[PDB]
Design a protein around this ligand. Structure first.
Ligand code: ZN
Ligand code: ZN
Ligand code: ZN
Ligand code: ZN
Lengths: 89, 196, 129, 157, 36, 61, 56, 228
RNA sequence: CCCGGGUAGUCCUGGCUGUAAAGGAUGCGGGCUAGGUGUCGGGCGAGCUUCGAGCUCGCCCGGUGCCGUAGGGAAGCCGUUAA
RNA sequence: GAGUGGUGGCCACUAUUAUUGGGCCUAAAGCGGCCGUAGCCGGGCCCGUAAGUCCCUGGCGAAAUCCCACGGCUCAACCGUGGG
């Protein structure tokens, strides 16, 4: 029995030094002028969370599943990441 | 029965096999003699001979290999190739003839004819690699593996091989259209077999 | 000694399919084997099959159409609910809705797809894909 | 495979699929029962009675004839014998095993160094115990019944 | 004594028979010293 | 091997040469088959097919 | 798309780089026959869809 | 277009040597799909260079391993180079080759040539439970491939999820065209030759599984090149 | 190590010890997965016979060896006597 | 990157604990061999009960913690309102 511990909102790369990942991340950093790699990893994990939610909801059946699918699509459209006529796919 | 008389078949000894036997040719085997020797079915041999002649009449004349490592079968193959225009390779089959393009005598046929699978395993192996139809003269103890067409016969004999190749060449010529009738063929059968 | 005629029959079918046979005989016969064969024929994994009486449990003659990649019995016969089929599908099949899990339910033996359609569970008795 | 020797011997009887007695049998069910009873009086065991009926009288098997007293079952040598009250008190196979076990013990007492025959006796007694357990479970023999060579001597006698 | 067939190989080792004999001698010496 | 094994033995109609009695016997007897009237041996047991010493009239199924 | 050849005996699709063969029917000559590497090795019989003629 | 003129030039300069080469030069064969599934032998790289010229792109050619090798003679050590390379187009055609030489360059040319000769055809699709689309972005279904002691199991994965497989395996899959897959490996994966050949066999085995016509629509199965 | 002698032992009758590269370095029962060819016991059919419980060929079941297809394995090799 | 290094501990790495899912001829490992008690696994068909099993429906399994949507602190961390 332990209490809650606040967790990190970003995930570090599995391997610190990979040539292709380093080059790609460097290009993204230079283009978008981010301060450090933790911001980029935060956005990357946001994308990963969205993708994981979509994958989990694709193979789910139940009223709660439909509600969550609709809420996910509505939230993405509100954020502007998807067009109005988007689909879960 | 129809191609040549049963008397000629028996004289050529096409029906005499060997002591050994395999289940691959149980259908072709006719009966068993008290000495343990097995006798083929002349009916089956004739039917498959007609079928093989019809099949071979459809190919380009210079795209048919005839191979036989057996000394008794070398000459009939040579004369069959000479008559039909097909290529014949009596004797030792040079490895890589069909597989190595750098060989001097490189050639890629459309169909292979083997006097004996066991004696011509090399040619059969190369033909399997290249992927072309195989026709084989099969005896009672021969396997039918990798054989697209099988002619049951006594492939070890002299007169048997000569008569088989004589009948074959005649059928290919008749079906192709060189001769208007079977009896028009003029080359004597006795010429096919070698002397002693 | 003999313990699972269903497993014996399914393994025999798999081996015959691998070798490339066209006909197979299953012995001993049973109602469970008959129903499994019925389901397989319904889904088109096998051809015509018939029963032969011999004064004993009986024999099944089955025609193979070269359409089975692998068929096998499931032991132990795990019970499964309607909402707990995805894990078994992943365990026993290559892709989603690729093969079929033959399940014995209270309304007879049927494929897991039919079980889900009817909204009932059962026990996994075999699989084939 | 065999229970002890562990080798696969597939020798046995090949019974053809049948559903009714042959049309060429020259005896009625009552005559068959009379023959079974008279042979049992003579003293042959059930297996011998069946063999004699098959050989001499040309009766393939009594199991082919329906039971006139119970339409739900077919006839049998043991069923006929118990209908007439001649059924063995102890099962025949168990009795045979016990008889040859006591004979083997008689031999072993005189030949104490026959270890191979002693092993054979051990296997025979294991078979006897298996059959005793099965018969106890099926209720054929009393629950307090036990196999003991001393009592088996009298039982065989 | 328990069986370790890997010990029978002679690559860089003394014969296991004689190692075993020596071990028995050592055990017997220890037992004598204890007084059993 | 066979899917539906069948017996290789057959029943035989036999006429006894001594008395002329008709009888039905097994081809592979395990005992000494005898006539039911004169008590004369008809078939003797062996390791396989029995040796028949009485006239054979028919072979049944 | 394009048609994938299938065996006449077993009906299974033939892989891109296996020792399979194809040839017109020796008897009639209208229908073609395909043989798998496995079928050829095992000497499994084949039947023309038209004639009914059977056997390698 | 550049690869099209390259094909035209090599066709002009090429003299046939084999039956398939003569057939291609004459023109009876005009699509790469027509040389497979017929039992022919490919002993001349000009056929591949003509029918699928994009395989000659440096970005489409990859070298997977370079190994020094030694054999003892009374005069010393004789050193040889073994180069394992992979080639193909990113649309469903891939090939793997091994070349031996006295120098890295000779080994590389021989390995690339053998990979061209060994090119094969694969089937792609989507069979993941979490994706259930009809695009050829992954393997249609789970497949197995074994070589030496290395066993590789490839499982479909949802779109956007990269290649979850060793470096050489993902290189081979990228060359083939696949871009989403999960992996499960057993044995000595550090043996690069065995691992690469196991992945090659796993990709090749996609043609050895019987599928009903409905499965093609269900999984969006595409053989060789797609709508491209 | 080689050569002449030699005690215990090796042998028998009652016991104890329970150990081996005690190895097929492979636990046991069951269903299925091409063949070929040796040999032992039994049964079936045919032909010979000097009429022999004799000889030869074919078939079925159970033993005991070799080669080998599919396939398995790191390979050696195993492969209906499976590893 | 206001963090970055060193040491100990736990999980993955490790299908080196293997129900999913490991091995035992030559690398670790088949008791020298067999008989058999508890346990485990057990031929075909019919009828009956429903203990296991499956489906539906009431009473429970505190809150906080976990996931989703909206709203309030500038967004967030945090908190509230609903669903799970
Ligand atoms: Zn009489
Ligand atoms: Zn035809
Ligand atoms: Zn096929
Ligand atoms: Zn997808």
């Amino acid at each position: 029995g332990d209490p809650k511990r606040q967790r990190k909102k970003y995930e570090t790369p599995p391997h610190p030094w990979i040539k292709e990942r380093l080059d790609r991340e460097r290009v993204l950093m230079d283009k978008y002028e981010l301060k450090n790699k933790k911001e980029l990893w935060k956005h990357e994990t946001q994308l990963k969370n969205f993708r994981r939610r979509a994958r989990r909801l694709l193979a789910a059946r139940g009223k709660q599943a439909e509600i969550e699918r609709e809420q996910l699509l509505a939230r993405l459209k509100r954020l502007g990441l998807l067009p109005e006529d988007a689909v879960l796919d | 029965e129809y191609l040549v008389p049963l008397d000629q078949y028996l004289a050529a000894g096409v029906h005499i096999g060997t002591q050994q036997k395999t289940k691959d040719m149980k259908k072709f085997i006719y009966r068993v003699r008290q000495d343990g020797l097995y006798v083929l079915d002349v009916r089956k041999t004739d039917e498959r001979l007609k079928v093989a002649g019809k099949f071979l009449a459809k190919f380009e004349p210079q795209s048919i290999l005839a191979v036989s490592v057996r000394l008794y079968g070398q000459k009939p193959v040579k004369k069959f190739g000479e008559v039909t225009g097909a290529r014949a390779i009596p004797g030792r089959f040079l490895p890589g003839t069909m597989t190595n393009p750098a060989v001097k005598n490189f050639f890629e046929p459309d169909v292979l004819i083997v006097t004996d699978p066991r004696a011509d395993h090399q040619a059969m192996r190369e033909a399997v690699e290249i992927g072309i139809p195989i026709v084989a003269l099969v005896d009672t103890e021969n396997l039918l593996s990798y054989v697209d067409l099988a002619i049951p016969t006594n492939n070890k004999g002299r007169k048997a091989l000569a008569l088989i190749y004589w009948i074959l060449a005649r059928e290919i010529l008749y079906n192709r259209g060189e001769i208007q009738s079977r009896e028009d063929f003029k080359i004597p059968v006795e010429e096919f077999e070698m002397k002693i | 000694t003999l313990l699972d005629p269903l497993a014996n029959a399914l393994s025999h079918i798999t081996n015959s399919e691998r070798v490339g046979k066209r006909e197979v005989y299953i012995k001993p016969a049973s109602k469970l084997i008959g129903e499994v064969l019925r389901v397989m024929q319904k889904y088109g994994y096998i051809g015509e099959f018939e029963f032969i009486d011999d004064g004993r449990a009986g024999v099944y003659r089955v025609q193979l159409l070269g359409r089975i990649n692998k068929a096998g019995a499931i032991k132990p016969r795990f019970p499964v609910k309607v909402s707990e089929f995805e894990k078994w599908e992943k365990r026993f099949l290559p892709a989603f809705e690729f093969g079929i899990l033959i399940v014995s339910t209270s309304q007879g033996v049927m494929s897991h797809k039919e079980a889900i359609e009817k909204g009932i569970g059962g026990r996994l008795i075999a699989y084939v894909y | 495979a065999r229970m002890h020797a562990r080798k696969r011997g597939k020798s046995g009887s090949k019974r053809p699929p049948r559903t009714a007695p042959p049309i060429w049998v020259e005896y009625t069910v009552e005559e068959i029962e009379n023959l079974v009873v008279k042979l049992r009086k003579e003293g042959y065991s059930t297996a011998m009675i069946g063999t004699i009926l098959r050989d001499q009288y040309g009766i393939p098997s009594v199991k082919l004839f329906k039971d006139p007293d119970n339409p739900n079952r077919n006839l049998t040598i043991t069923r006929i014998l118990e209908k007439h009250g001649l059924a063995p008190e102890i099962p025949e196979d168990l009795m045979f095993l016990i008889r040859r076990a006591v004979n083997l013990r008689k031999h072993l007492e005189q030949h104490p160094k026959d270890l191979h025959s002693m092993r054979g006796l051990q296997l025979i007694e294991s078979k006897i115990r298996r059959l005793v357990k099965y018969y106890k479970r099926k209720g054929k023999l009393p629950k307090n019944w036990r196999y003991d060579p001393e009592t088996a001597k009298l039982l065989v006698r | 004594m328990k069986r370790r067939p890997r010990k029978w190989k002679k690559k860089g080792r003394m014969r296991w028979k004689w190692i075993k004999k020596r071990i028995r001698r050592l055990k017997r010496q220890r037992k004598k010293e204890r007084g059993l | 091997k066979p899917i539906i094994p069948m017996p290789r033995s057959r029943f035989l109609r036999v006429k006894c040469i001594d008395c002329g009695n008709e009888q039905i016997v097994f081809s592979h007897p395990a005992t000494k088959v005898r006539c039911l009237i004169c008590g004369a041996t008809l078939v003797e047991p062996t390791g396989g097919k029995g040796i028949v010493k009485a006239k054979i009239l028919e072979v049944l199924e | 798309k394009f048609e994938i050849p299938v065996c006449t005996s077993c009906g299974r699709e033939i892989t891109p780089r296996e020792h399979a063969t194809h040839f017109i029917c020796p008897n009639c000559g209208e229908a073609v026959i395909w043989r798998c590497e496995s079928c050829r090795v095992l000497a499994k019989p084949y039947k023309c869809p038209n004639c009914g003629w059977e056997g390698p | 277009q550049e690869w099209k003129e390259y094909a035209k030039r090599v066709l002009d300069e090429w003299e046939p040597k084999t039956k398939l080469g003569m057939m291609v030069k004459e023109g009876q064969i005009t699509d790469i799909h027509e040389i497979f599934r017929r039992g022919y032998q490919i002993k001349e790289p000009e056929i591949i260079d003509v029918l699928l010229p994009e395989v000659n792109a440096r970005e489409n050619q990859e070298v997977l391993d370079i190994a020094l090798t030694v054999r003892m003679t009374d005069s010393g050590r004789r050193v040889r180079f073994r180069v394992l390379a992979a080639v193909g187009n990113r649309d469903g055609y891939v090939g793997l080759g091994i070349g031996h030489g006295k120098e890295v360059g000779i080994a590389i040319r021989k390995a690339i040539n053998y990979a061209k000769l060994n090119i094969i055809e694969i089937k792609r699709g989507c069979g993941s439970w979490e994706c259930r689309c009809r695009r050829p972005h992954s393997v249609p279904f789970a497949v197995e491939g074994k070589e030496g002691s290395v066993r590789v199991r490839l499982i479909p994965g949802p779109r956007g999820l990269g290649l979850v497989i060793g470096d050489v395996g993902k290189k081979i899959l990228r060359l083939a065209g696949v871009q989403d897959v999960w992996s499960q490996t057993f044995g000595e994966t550090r043996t690069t030759v065995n691992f690469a050949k196991a992945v090659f066999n796993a990709l090749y085995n996609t043609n050895r599984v019987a599928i009903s016509p409905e499965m093609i629509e269900r999984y969006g199965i595409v053989v060789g090149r797609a709508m491209p």
